[PDB]
Design a protein around this ligand. Sequence first.
Ligand SMILES: CNC(=O)C[C@@H](Cc1ccc(OP(=O)(O)O)cc1)C(=O)N[C@@H](CCC(=O)O)C(=O)N[C@@H](CC(N)=O)C(N)=O
Ligand SMILES: [Cl-]
Ligand SMILES: [Cl-]
Ligand SMILES: [Mg+2]
Length: 100
Amino acid sequence: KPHPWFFGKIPRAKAEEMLSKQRHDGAFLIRESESAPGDFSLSVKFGNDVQHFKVLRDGAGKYFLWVVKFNSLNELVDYHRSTSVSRNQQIFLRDIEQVP
Ligand SMILES: CNC(=O)C[C@@H](Cc1ccc(OP(=O)(O)O)cc1)C(=O)N[C@@H](CCC(=O)O)C(=O)N[C@@H](CC(N)=O)C(N)=O
Ligand SMILES: [Cl-]
Ligand SMILES: [Cl-]
Ligand SMILES: [Mg+2]
């Protein structure tokens, strides 16, 4: 039942270390930014690179990456599983392969 994508306060570098070991493009995690307290960040695997996106907020507290906004991080993540997170490549969010 708990979400396998919330890693809390893990450094940007630790997110890259973790995702570099993932095999599939789109393997991701939501973390709580250290450089900007109170803000969330989306780290995604693509090739042997890891892309980082800042989870932006509107005036009402809704969450977005580019244009489409949501009431929760959960809804933002779910939308981005079928619509690309990147404007340069087709990267669709997929759950990480966890260590059992
Ligand atoms: C290497 N550059 C970055 O990590 C900056 C990111 C945004 C970003 C992410 C994290 C961050 O600090 P932290 O939580 O400590 O990691 C600061 C800026 C970016 O521009 N990402 C790209 C997408 C990924 C890539 O092409 O490398 C983008 O165009 N982001 C858009 C959309 C978005 N919501 O981030 C933007 N810059 O507004
Ligand atoms: Cl994997
Ligand atoms: Cl913001
Ligand atoms: Mg798309």
